[PDB]
Amino acid sequence: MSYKLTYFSIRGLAEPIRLFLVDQDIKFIDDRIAKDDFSSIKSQFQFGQLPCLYDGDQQIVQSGAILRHLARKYNLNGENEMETTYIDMFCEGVRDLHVKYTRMIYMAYETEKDPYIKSILPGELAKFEKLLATRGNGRNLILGDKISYADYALFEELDVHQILDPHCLDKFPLLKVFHQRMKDRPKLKEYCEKRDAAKVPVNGNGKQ
Amino acid sequence: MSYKLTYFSIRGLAEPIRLFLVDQDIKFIDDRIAKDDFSSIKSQFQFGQLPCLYDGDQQIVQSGAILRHLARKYNLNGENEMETTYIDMFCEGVRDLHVKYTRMIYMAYETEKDPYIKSILPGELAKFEKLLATRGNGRNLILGDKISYADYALFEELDVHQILDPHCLDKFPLLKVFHQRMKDRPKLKEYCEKRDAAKVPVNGNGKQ
Ligand SMILES: N[C@@H](CCC(=O)N[C@@H](CS)C(=O)NCC(=O)O)C(=O)O
Numbered sequence: 122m123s124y125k126l127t128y129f130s131i132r133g134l135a136e137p138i139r140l141f142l143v144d145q146d147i148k149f150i151d152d153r154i155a156k157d158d159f160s161s162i163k164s165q166f167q168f169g170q171l172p173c174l175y176d177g178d179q180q181i182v183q184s185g186a187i188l189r190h191l192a193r194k195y196n197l198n199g200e201n202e203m204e205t206t207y208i209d210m211f212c213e214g215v216r217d218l219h220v221k222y223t224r225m226i227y228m229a230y231e232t233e234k235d236p237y238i239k240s241i242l243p244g245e246l247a248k249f250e251k252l253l254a255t256r257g258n259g260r261n262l263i264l265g266d267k268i269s270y271a272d273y274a275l276f277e278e279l280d281v282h283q284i285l286d287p288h289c290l291d292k293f294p295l296l297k298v299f300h301q302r303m304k305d306r307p308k309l310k311e312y313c314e315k316r317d318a319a320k321v322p323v324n325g326n327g328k329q
Numbered sequence: 330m331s332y333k334l335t336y337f338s339i340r341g342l343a344e345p346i347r348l349f350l351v352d353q354d355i356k357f358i359d360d361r362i363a364k365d366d367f368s369s370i371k372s373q374f375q376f377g378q379l380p381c382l383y384d385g386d387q388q389i390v391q392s393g394a395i396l397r398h399l400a401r402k403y404n405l406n407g408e409n410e411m412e413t414t415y416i417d418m419f420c421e422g423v424r425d426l427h428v429k430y431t432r433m434i435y436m437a438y439e440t441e442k443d444p445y446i447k448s449i450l451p452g453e454l455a456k457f458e459k460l461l462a463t464r465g466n467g468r469n470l471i472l473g474d475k476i477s478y479a480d481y482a483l484f485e486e487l488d489v490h491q492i493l494d495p496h497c498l499d500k501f502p503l504l505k506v507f508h509q510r511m512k513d514r515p516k517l518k519e520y521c522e523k524r525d526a527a528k529v530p531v532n533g534n535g536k537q
């Protein structure tokens with residue numbers, strides 16, 4: 122295959138890219154590296170880190186760059202400058218939430234999970250609930266009727282946050298419905314079931 | 330003026346955008362707001378944060394989305410898909426260094442500045458020295474002869490690290506020459522002189 126995605130055997134940073142590839146029926150080698158095997162190959166990557174997408178002869182690190190590249194190549198990058206900018210802005214906001222999430226998971230799970238759920242996460246979700254409403258009244262996908270790369274990022278972020286706090290979307294009807302809509306896309310539902318069967322952890326420390 | 334960039338009165342995340350606009354001679358309102366005045370306007374921004382670029386009637390937050398929007402408008406986003414991906418990937422690496430730098434600055438300046446300078450920074454710069462070589466032998470700009478948005482981000486990151494450690498580029502000749510090449514661009518030379526004269530803070534806590 123001409124695509125290989127190299128990452129750890131967790132959802133982590135790679136998962137939005139995996140979701141994009143699966144939902145767009147782009148076949149790829151899902152090259153999942155065990156933690157102890159990474160030091161031997163680390164210098165092969167331009168910043169010594171994963172994920173890495175090999176796209177033919179091109180070696181592309183940086184999760185944001187990988188997803189934006191795929192979006193251009195497969196016409197999931199919006200239809201005009203305003204759209205392209207908007208989904209970039211939106212997806213970058215998703216990455217900011219993921220930074221907060223990961224800091225709590227890796228650095229302070231036992232003490233910071235509950236204050237995160239109660240006192241950080243709701244305000245962050247509220248920003249997305251408001252923003253989502255600006256296209257299609259937020260009642261379909263981020264750009265309205267046409268899927269874009271940002272939808273996969275938002276879906277994964279909402280999904281991992283529901284694992285963390287099953288009630289977190291209760292009071293955010295647009296986000297709750299978006300998550301429902303995405304999970305019901307058949308290629309994503311099938312893949313979710315394979316991923317559950319494989320007992321894939323969200324994060325590298327087994328907490329979630 | 331039709332372009333307005335709103336950020337705090339520090340370099341921070343806005344500075345690569347300011348550098349883009351200054352170097353490209355895109356006249357803009359440099360809207361620098363005081364810490365204490367942000368609360369009253371925070372809800373006007375899609376994630377409650379700055380920087381924000383107003384481009385005519387378009388309000389764009391997220392520094393990376395702002396930069397890529399400007400890059401598309403002004404043809405500083407590469408000439409083909411591979412270049413577009415490359416500069417993004419490069420810029421994302423710069424942002425990762427900036428995350429490390431800012432964690433040190435804001436969380437541990439008094440005890441971890443010296444370890445950062447000695448033990449973290451050199452290996453991080455080495456990754457850039459190596460990657461920069463891939464186009465134009467690394468002897469000009471990131472894409473070779475043509476400027477891109479990533480050049481401004483790299484320039485700023487090298488500049489703030491030389492403030493931190495004046496000797497940090499001693500062992501990285503491509504980076505050292507690149508930093509000087511950028512600073513010698515006429516619009517940047519003038520701007521940087523004035524920025525230095527005013528001792529514009531790099532960071533919001535005045536440490537650098
Ligand atoms: N900005 C990066 C971050 C990549 C990153 O932090 N990678 C981590 C895994 S989540 C890693 O490769 N750690 C292994 C190491 O540094 O040895 C990206 O979005 O791809």
Ligand SMILES: N[C@@H](CCC(=O)N[C@@H](CS)C(=O)NCC(=O)O)C(=O)O
Pocket residue numbers: 213217341342367377378379380390391392393
């Ligand atoms: N991912 C964002 C980060 C924006 C951000 O962290 N903004 C900070 C300044 S560095 C801010 O507006 N702080 C004000 C606040 O949250 O009250 C971007 O690149 O623009």
